[PDB]
RNA sequence: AAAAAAAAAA
RNA sequence: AAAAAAAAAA
RNA sequence: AAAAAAAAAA
RNA sequence: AAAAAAAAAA
RNA sequence: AAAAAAAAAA
RNA sequence: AAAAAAAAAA
RNA sequence: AAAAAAAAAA
RNA sequence: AAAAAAAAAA
RNA sequence: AAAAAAAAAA
RNA sequence: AAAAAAAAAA
RNA sequence: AAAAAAAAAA
RNA sequence: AAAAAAAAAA
RNA sequence: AAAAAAAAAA
RNA sequence: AAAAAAAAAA
């Protein structure tokens, strides 16, 4: 009830509820990957699941949506740049959203958003996306509901 | 942006964000402990932390409400009944909340709400309350948050 | 139901209610400590566990304010005072509240309030606060929640 | 004046006030009777008096309502009755209020209103009530004052 | 009352106040600590105790909230980051906020709120919070009340 | 944010901000002086700066207000008196602000205000104003702003 | 014209304005006079010119009213009591306005108002009122203007 | 707030 | 009147 | 309620 | 009329 | 009051 | 929100 | 827009 | 603007 | 503010 | 007209 | 009409 | 709330 | 519906 | 919501 109360009060409990002692929870992820010039780099999605996240007790998650940012400055006399190609288990896309910094000191970032007829589960196996930068680390933020 | 949109699209990501991999949760944990008759049960805090509710990675939880139901049918001749006594680091409380079933074929139940100005953190050497019932097991939902 | 009903009348009771044999209770509880000219006397939270305020049945008390008076003549030439100091087991404080008598034949008083973030419980071996006064007595009035 | 506030405050108290550390207090009181089979059993008020309810404190208590619930099972193939009879110190009453079980695995129960007139104190050698069931037990649930 | 007067006047003065020589005070602490890569740093509260800061007066302080700021620049290649970890008397906890750069040249922040629940004194030899960071100096600015 | 939030959140802290480690502080300063029959008492600013108010760090002071209250009983058949005659840097006022108890067993009180136009800085050397009374001590009470 | 302004400012003053180096004064002045048992003691007008109340420089005052009050303790068992008597040089009044103390440890006091037809001026050597008392000295202020 | 004395004003 | 603790209610 | 000092905010 | 200093007031 | 120059501002 | 290209519609 | 300093005005 | 701490008020 | 996941409610 | 994909905008 | 005791009710 | 029985009423 | 934790937004 | 007991308040 809120309080102002300043002590243990009683519930009038009911009959036993429905519970779930193993539920959902949608989060952010931050994770780093290492990326070689010229190469694509696939991203698993078994880097999702990790004490470090508090995910370990998961095995699927729908992946919503996908950011990235340039991690590490990019080579002499390039702005930084990071791709990101979306990949599914039905049918991989060939969209290579794209997003260059304006200003050499500063991160370049891009992100894709997952439709909803395409939110199936994936597991470890699996891979999100291809990432491609001048830059030899990327940072990404995927938002996903862990089940 | 929800839909209609059945291809991926792009997301314009702006700077990176403030991120956290290891957040708190709010959850109600359901659990069971054996009784015996005529002693109280002291009721650990550690049993909230486990894989079993994919809780193993918090050291510390607060809690906010505890309710009980007897969990196994009473001795012949009786109808259940529940009683929790809070305990606190600062000071144990006397109160003995008491729930009885009205039909012999059904469980007692009760609980206790902790005012804001007790809810402090616990750990696993920590006990949250005392349990006393005629029935040899009694079920628990906390309710509390991780973090 | 009230009255203007002279006979005794029948209460269609249910199911057996949720109960309580030992319950919390919000009190103002009356002492007086002796006090030394010149050394503060700290106050335990033991005194207010007795038969003679009905509590001795408690362990916990959560303290809300105190308030206290002078209860004894000052010394020749001087008006009464008192003052108090806050303790918690968390970290003591060292505001000094103080409270002067503008007529020398009047007590003096002073009180805090506790803020709601502090009010956890206390034991009878803790120490509510520190008294000072150049009167051998003072009385206090604490405001409580016996749990 | 409630919070928001974070920190020790004082208070200007003012004159001592008027008090009283042996308050009255307003309760619900839960405790059971043995009963036999078809002999009435006197309740006496001196139940109402225990360190187990934090009331041996008090002589006098002002009853204002009684209430009952058989507390164990009834003998094979009926269904659970309890009856209650009002007995006063000015003279008793000859109603027998009823209430009967309609599953027999379900607990009678009926209660009886004092009205205004007859509510005066009663001391540990009265008696509250007779109690008539086909249970051996039989749980009371008393609201009265203490004083 | 603010004035136009650009002489003494009289006040009417009534009886003596209430007084105290000691008061709180609610403040914003800015200090640096150095720390090392890959080691966590625990923050002491003792940091907060000084004539530095007017402070060493106080033994007690209550903390709210914690901001933090790299102050150095970073490793060659690396954007700035800091992270903050939550510690508790009651029970420490395992969020880990973290802030990054998105300029080399930029410093990285993040800060956490504690909440009401929590705010409880804290002193000298107790600590705030854990600091990591990829630069040699981290500066923070506390926001505290002072008791 | 306030609250009703139970667990440490997140602060999404911008730029380093402007800081002050040694800020300005606006109180009321309660102390005492010895005062001789028939010979003006001149009150040094500083009496002002001690750690016994937590104002030993500062250097300088801006007085606002002065109040000042007879601290023991007068001589016998008298009812006590308190002057205050403002003294100023710029030059000195003659002014004697009195006032006079009228009843023997109270304390006589009197302040007087400063304008605008008169609240510089004031060191240790300087002083405030001159005292004159029938009692042997006089309590001040000085609303100042320390810088 | 008041201010915001901050530095000096010319004033287009116009022709010589009529002037007045000796102008009047409107004031209440204290003072005390002695007085005996049973002797009715007449107050010189010459009292109120005097360096100690920066009105030397006058020979005559209007004086509009006189108020009296008893400067020191009444006898053993009294209470005190102060009586004044109207003067004036077109005739004596023979009114003789009384005031009591109702608390031994107060003063007594009483004032009487001089009507706009008696408001003439008076000098030195004329005499304001009798005044009679139980106490050895009385304190007036009488309302007059200097002129 | 209203008045009176000294000062000030569009 | 508004709150909190115990009791009571259509 | 209005102000000033320290803290906090959409 | 509005202000400030001294005085006065229901 | 309106303007211009210097200063100041939510 | 308004437009244009591809798709869709009562 | 409001203020202050210098200038200007019916 | 709203809050909290210190100060101030009709 | 609106949504979704976990928690809470008259 | 409303939607979705690509483009455009104060 | 309003109340109290016994009975009755959507 | 409406009724009936016993009681009560301006 | 209102709240809190995680996520999302013009 | 209304009451009573304990506590609190402009
Ligand atoms: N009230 C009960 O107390 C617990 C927490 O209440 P609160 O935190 O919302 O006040 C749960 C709720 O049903
Ligand atoms: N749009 C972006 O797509 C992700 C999921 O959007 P939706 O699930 O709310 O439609 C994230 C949001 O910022
Ligand atoms: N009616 C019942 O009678 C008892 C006291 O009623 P009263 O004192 O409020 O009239 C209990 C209430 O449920
Ligand atoms: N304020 C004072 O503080 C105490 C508790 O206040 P609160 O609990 O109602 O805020 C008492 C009250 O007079
Ligand atoms: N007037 C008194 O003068 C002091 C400062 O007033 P001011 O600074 O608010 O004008 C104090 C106040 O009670
Ligand atoms: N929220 C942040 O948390 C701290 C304290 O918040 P609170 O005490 O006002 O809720 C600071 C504020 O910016
Ligand atoms: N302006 C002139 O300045 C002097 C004082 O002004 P002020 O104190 O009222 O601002 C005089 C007035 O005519």
Redesign the pocket.
């Known amino acids: 009830?809120g309080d102002?109360?300043?002590?243990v009060?009683?519930?009038r409990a009911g009959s036993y509820p429905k519970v779930?002692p193993t539920?959902?929870?949608?989060?952010?992820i931050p994770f780093e990957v290492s990326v070689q010039s010229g190469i694509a780099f696939k991203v698993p999605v078994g880097s999702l699941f990790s004490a470090n996240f508090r995910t370990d007790s998961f095995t699927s998650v729908t992946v919503?949506?996908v950011r990235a940012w340039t991690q590490l400055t990019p080579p002499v006399n390039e702005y930084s740049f990071v791709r990101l190609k979306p990949l599914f288990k039905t049918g991989d896309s060939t969209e290579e959203f794209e997003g260059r910094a304006s200003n050499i000191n500063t991160r370049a970032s891009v992100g894709y958003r997952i439709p909803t007829n395409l939110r199936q589960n994936t597991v470890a196996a699996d891979n999100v996306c291809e990432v491609r930068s001048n830059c030899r680390q990327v940072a990404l933020?995927i938002?996903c509901?862990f089940n």
């Not at 102002?4 to 002590?7: C, G, P, R």
């Not at 539920?23 to 952010?28: G, I, Q």
């Open positions: 009830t102002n109360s300043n002590v009060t009683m519930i779930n539920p959902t929870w949608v989060r952010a919503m949506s933020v938002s509901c």
